[PDB]
């Protein structure tokens, strides 16, 4: 496991092109599944049939995504394990994320613009 900013962990699952990495502000297209530590799924873009898009590195998303996504290359699949302070902190998110939760995201980087 690689330990990056905040103590977020990356487990590399299957490789990308090893050369096309997102830079600050780039639009990324990602499919994800999010689970709690006990393995209980809370959300998935795959279940919606629509990949998620954001600009990375600008605070649109939780800190653990801004930390982890730039370390992936196009096509890569990885698991991000994100401690509470890099996710939803003491507050959580109603109906989905308890207080102080470590979150697990399986992510696939589909495209970079
Ligand atoms: C503008 C309102 C609706 C708007 C909703 C969308 C565009 C649809 C988009 C697919 C979100 C999902 O909708 C099905 C759903 O995704 C989750 O299930 C989820 O897996 C998740 O954790 N994601 C989504 C994928 C990127 C990482 C993370 C996130 O960073 O999400 C971001 C997030 C909530 C950041 C908060 C912002 C407030 C801060 O206080 C907090 O700081 C701790 C962090 C999302 C993208 C926001 O930028 C935009 C929105 O909220 C959340 C558990 C709840 C969230 O629904 C709300």
Provide structural commentary.
- This protein has 113 residues and is mainly beta.
- The protein has a single domain (1-113), classed as Chitinase A, domain 3 (Roll).
- Helix content is 9%, strand content 37%.
- It has helices at 45-48, 63-68; strands at residues 2-3, 9-14, 27-36, 41-44, 52-55, 77-82, 103-112.
- Strands 1, 2, 3, 4, 5, 6 and 7 form a 7-stranded antiparallel beta sheet that branches.
- The site of 8-deethyl-8-[BUT-3-enyl]-ascomycin has 14 residues, from strand 3 and strand 4.
- Residues 32, 34, 42-43, 52, 60-62, 65, 88-89, 93, 96-97 line the site of 8-deethyl-8-[BUT-3-enyl]-ascomycin (FK5).
Largest sheet: 7 strands, antiparallel
What is the total number of structural domains?
A: 1
Structural class: mainly beta
Shape: globular
Terminal Cα separation, in Å? 28 Å
Strand content: 35-45%
Q: Radius of gyration, rounded?
A: 13 Å
CATH class placement = Alpha Beta
What do we call the CATH topology?
A: Chitinase A, domain 3
Organism: Candida glabrata (strain ATCC 2001 / BCRC 20586 / JCM 3761 / NBRC 0622 / NRRL Y-65 / CBS 138) (Yeast)
Subcellular location: Cytoplasm
Function: PPIases accelerate the folding of proteins. It catalyzes the cis-trans isomerization of proline imidic peptide bonds in oligopeptides.
Protein name: FK506-binding protein 1
Give the SSE map.
Elements: E1 2-3, E2 9-14, E3 27-36, E4 41-44, H1 45-48, E5 52-55, H2 63-68, E6 77-82, E7 103-112
Antiparallel strand pairs: 1-2, 2-6, 3-4, 3-5, 3-7, 6-7
The chain binds 8-deethyl-8-[BUT-3-enyl]-ascomycin (FK5).
PDB class: isomerase
Keywords: fkbp12, fungal pathogen, FK506, self catalysis, isomerase
Assembly: monomeric
